[PDB]
Structure 1
Amino acid sequence: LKKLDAGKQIKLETTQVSGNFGTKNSSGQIVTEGNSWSDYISQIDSISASI
């Protein structure tokens, strides 16, 4: 608290993010449950180059 009040600044970093995506079942409904993007982050980062 003393360091905060002295003038030092405090920063926030986005360590990670998690969330689902939307697919289709037999019907026309869009389902987003148990479809975590975290399942594909590593593979996509491994086999692709960023621009």
Structure 2
Amino acid sequence: TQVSGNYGTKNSQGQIITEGNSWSNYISQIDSVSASIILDTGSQTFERRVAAKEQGNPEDKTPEITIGEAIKKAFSATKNGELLYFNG
């Protein structure tokens, strides 16, 4: 149903702290400004989230990109002109 964990931020003293941090604060926020994209390779599964602009919002400036470009961005899959390959 849910998972709880931490994330790390390099503080002013140069260390990495994962005590005052939690992901639960951002799960709701990430889910509401991003478009879910999944890639399935038969044995492995990948799940990403790509931000997109609100429909009727004049002060929103999130860039507009196409589905093909977003899949290229969200997986870092190389493009040799037109064909798109992830790991061959």
TM-score, reference length from structure 2: 0.40
**Percent of paired sites with the same residue:** 86
Over 6 Å off, 4+ runs: none
Larger radius of gyration: 1
Q: Deviations over 1:1-51 (max 9, x none)?
A: xxxxxxxxxxxxxx1001010001111100001211000000100110110
Aligned length: 37
Is 2:31 the counterpart of 1:45?
yes
Q: Which runs of 5+ in 1 are unaligned?
A: 1-14
Question: RCO higher in 1 or 2 (8 Å CA, sep ≥ 6)?
Answer: 1
Structure with the larger helix share: 1
Matches within 5 A, 1:19-30: 19-30=5-16
Q: Which structure is higher in strand share?
A: 2
